[PDB]
Amino acid sequence: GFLGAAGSTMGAASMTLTVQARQLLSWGIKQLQARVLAVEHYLKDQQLLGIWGCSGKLICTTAVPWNATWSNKTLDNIWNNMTWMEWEKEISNYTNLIYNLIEESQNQQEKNETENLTLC
């Protein structure tokens, strides 16, 4: 069910990403603004995923080792004994700067594909 995994652990919840994804897009100014806003949010997230090398993926591992702070929990404490809501609270901070690192890394990799990385 839609959002039914919210109280489930992160591992189990990773199997419903398409359940939520389908539901992220699904006086007349009021209704048009509601539809345009939903479209803008969808495209905003898709552009962010595509500026990163994550386009078309549901699970995307990027070119970023973990840096100082960012997370205070290990893999088992996060994936098996914690929910995604608890995780969002756990990392409610550290929600920026990493995006520019990923963006620059992806742009550097795409340039490298035409200069020195697995070249032409």
Partner: protein, 428 residues
Amino acid sequence: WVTVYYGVPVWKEATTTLFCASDNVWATHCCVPTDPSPQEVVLENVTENFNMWKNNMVEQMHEDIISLWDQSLKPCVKLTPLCVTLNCTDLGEIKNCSFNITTSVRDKMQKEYATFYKLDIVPIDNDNNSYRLINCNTSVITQACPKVSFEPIPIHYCAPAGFAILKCNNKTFNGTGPCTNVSTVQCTHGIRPVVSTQLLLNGSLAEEEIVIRSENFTDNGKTIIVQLNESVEINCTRPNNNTRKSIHIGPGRAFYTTGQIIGNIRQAHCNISRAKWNNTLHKIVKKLREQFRNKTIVFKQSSGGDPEIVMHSFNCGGEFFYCNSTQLFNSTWYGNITLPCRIKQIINLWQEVGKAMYAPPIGGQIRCSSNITGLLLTRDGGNNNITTEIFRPGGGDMRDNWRSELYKYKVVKIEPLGVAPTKCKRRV
């Protein structure tokens, strides 16, 4: 290693614009079809923080109702030719008023007759015969279109994609704080936009006993919302067999008034079941004593006969009733009913400046079959040291007529993009 996940079932509380679905002013507005029976996902092992007193769904409902009412009255007759001296003779609650009004033809004036209630007639001279239409001095009185129904019907408020409405399923929830039984819906239940000031007619019943909620219960000047698990049947009767006639005042624009009353003229009364009301008050005080312990509970009213401040104002479908609340809230609790009511045709439900509405009469006789599903009460301050707790009807504003139904819903913004550690390398 950092892994990006999209479609994560997480959200934040957020305020967004909601749209409306429905199975009349609400018809053709709530144009979206309703769910083919409720589409609800129960969320197990979750806790969600609710706050019915700061819920922007109520504020949006308030604005949406005002906007709908304002739009609905625009393509209708504006009763400006009627702000003339009236010659009114008692039938003296209801008067037969005659006046010289210019009709649709600019060269001709007719002497017309109309029936007006005392509450809509302002004395303007000392001859006891010259009267004027109430508030026409400073405001524009717009006649409601007789073909447009303002009857409250169930409507469903729906979130746009990317947002969801969470519902609290805790039958005894206090209205604020953590809720341990939460479900996800796309639309709210069939909420009834009933206009009332104290009685909360045609609402939802409590799942268990009587649940009494307030923002504080110790602060003075705040509404106490009492939700009942049993309805009280009220049959408000206006036993006046009216025959309605129209007066043509413009080019196809006509004023609707009662042309004649057939039979006797009698005051409208609400026939409230005595046993059900007495049991309702008994159960209310029994639950109320859990919050106001070791106190006697009495009802001592507010002030005098002010139709818009003290009296109970409610709609019936064009005939607006203003009832004397002292019939129901005058008892002392420790250890049929006939409520007299007045009718007012010139109303200003949202206290707008410069505008008013004329409600056309309903012909024949009417019965307002309704249920008491809750009450809006205000506690009398300064009685904490007299051993008796004093409560009165009323207080608050129109928002409290919707908060009592939307208390179990909140709108949340979905944040599908999450970041989590992995074991995999990028393998660039």
